[PDB]
Amino acid sequence: PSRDALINRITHQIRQSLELDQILRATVEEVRAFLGTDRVKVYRFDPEGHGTVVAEARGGERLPSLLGLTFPAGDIPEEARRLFRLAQVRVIVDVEAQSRSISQPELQRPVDPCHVHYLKSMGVASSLVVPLMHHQELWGLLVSHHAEPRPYSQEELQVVQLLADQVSIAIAQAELLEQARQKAQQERLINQIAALVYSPLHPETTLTTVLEQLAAGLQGIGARLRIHFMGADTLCCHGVQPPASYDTWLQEQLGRAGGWVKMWSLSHLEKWPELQEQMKQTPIRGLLVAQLAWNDQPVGWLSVFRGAVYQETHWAGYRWFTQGDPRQELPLISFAAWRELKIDEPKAWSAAEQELMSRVGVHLALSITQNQLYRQLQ
Numbered sequence: 001p002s003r004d005a006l007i008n009r010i011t012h013q014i015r016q017s018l019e020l021d022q023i024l025r026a027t028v029e030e031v032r033a034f035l036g037t038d039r040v041k042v043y044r045f046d047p048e049g050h051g052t053v054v055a056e057a058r059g060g061e062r063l064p065s066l067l068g069l070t071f072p073a074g075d076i077p078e079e080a081r082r083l084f085r086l087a088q089v090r091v092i093v094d095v096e097a098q099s100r101s102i103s104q105p106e107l108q109r110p111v112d113p114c115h116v117h118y119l120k121s122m123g124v125a126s127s128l129v130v131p132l133m134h135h136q137e138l139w140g141l142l143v144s145h146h147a148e149p150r151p152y153s154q155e156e157l158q159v160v161q162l163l164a165d166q167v168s169i170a171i172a173q174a175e176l177l178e179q180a181r182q183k184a185q186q187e188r189l190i191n192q193i194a195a196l197v198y199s200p201l202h203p204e205t206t207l208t209t210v211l212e213q214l215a216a217g218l219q220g221i222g223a224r225l226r227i228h229f230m231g232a233d234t235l236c237c238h239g240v241q242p243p244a245s246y247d248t249w250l251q252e253q254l255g256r257a258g259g260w261v262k263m264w265s266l267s268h269l270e271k272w273p274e275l276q277e278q279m280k281q282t283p284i285r286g287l288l289v290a291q292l293a294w295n296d297q298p299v300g301w302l303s304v305f306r307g308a309v310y311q312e313t314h315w316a317g318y319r320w321f322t323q324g325d326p327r328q329e330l331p332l333i334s335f336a337a338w339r340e341l342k343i344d345e346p347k348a349w350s351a352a353e354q355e356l357m358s359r360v361g362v363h364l365a366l367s368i369t370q371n372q373l374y375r376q377l378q
């Protein structure tokens with residue numbers, strides 16, 4: 001009926017863009033408009049299971065904004081994620097009655113008291129959670145909260161489920177486009193670095209920009225390059241730098257020959273407590289290192305540095321972070337917990353980024369070896 005026309009229009013709106021942010025904003029807005037509820041949100045999960053409120057629509061100021069909030073994976077037990085990975089919608093109509101209805105696509109159960117206390121503390125009277133699948137995994141959740149009690153029609157449930165399936169498809173296609181674009185940008189960065197590597201300009205001028213653009217494309221707070229080959233011993237830096245002893249460290253752990261690419265977090269430097277502490281006194285929390293050695297002989301070292309991942313977000317820009325709404329008590333505690341897990345942990349680099357590091361390192365090693373052999377034959 002008019003239901004199918006509504007689903008058609010909303011699906012057109014969700015699928016209009018291949019940009020993930022536009023997809024999720026259209027999703028939350030359209031679903032909140034359909035349901036008339038106070039707050040509709042999308043929670044996205046990371047590989048470790050931690051959740052981030054990545055999109056949000058509100059009908060007014062009755063419920064506070066949670067956009068940008070992050071919470072530890074443990075806030076949703078694996079027992080709940082099991083049901084969600086088996087495609088399962090969960091509605092709590094009354095928080096005071098503590099009822100929990102569970103429905104499948106295509107009658108009342110109890111609910112854990114801790115989650116009831118959580119929803120009460122946020123001033124949430126009614127909750128509807130629909131899972132968002134990506135291939136076989138649980139990409140995230142579509143969440144509708146309301147400050148007064150309200151039931152949910154079965155046709156409302158099926159409309160939200162069908163919209164969730166369209167959201168899943170849009171997520172997959174946006175991912176296809178994003179992977180293509182990232183592959184393009186990575187190859188472009190490799191070639192742009194090679195453009196400056198063999199350039200006849202002053203090495204200190206070109207290589208500093210090389211390190212700067214390398215740090216840029218790998219979202220690193222800094223970059224460093226130490227060449228120690230034949231008669232050439234040089235050190236170029238950009239951005240945040242480690243203590244100089246780091247260089248000597250890389251020379252004494254060469255057996256961990258040839259060329260390689262390695263990742264390290266601050267935690268991985270537990271063996272060397274003095275270097276670990278010096279590194280701590282630095283914003284550096286992650287290191288991507290490439291031993292420049294295209295030939296069998298070691299040539300140098302190329303490093304990119306990332307900070308702690310928590311610092312990568314302007315948490316003070318959010319309303320929930322600074323303003324003392326009591327309903328933000330338990331969410332903020334959750335955030336605190338998450339902050340305790342990622343206060344010294346960096347964002348890891350992908351396998352594609354490590355391969356990029358390896359390729360840039362091969363270019364660097366070959367270039368330096370060629371130049372030094374040409375200067376030694378003189």
Ligand SMILES: CCC1=C(C)/C(=C/C2=NC(=C\c3[nH]c(/C=C4\NC(=O)[C@H](C)[C@H]4CC)c(C)c3CCC(=O)O)/C(CCC(=O)O)=C2C)NC1=O
Nearest residue numbers: 053066069071075076077080090111112114115129331334
């Ligand atoms: C963005 C702010 C926010 C957070 C963080 C949040 C947490 C949260 N707790 C959930 C469930 C759950 N959470 C818990 C347990 C707990 N959870 C805790 O934070 C405690 C540490 C612990 C109790 C001691 C349990 C047991 C469930 C499953 C409840 C059930 O369906 O029976 C779910 C899954 C949705 C659902 O099935 O209702 C979410 C999203 N909800 C929000 O809106």
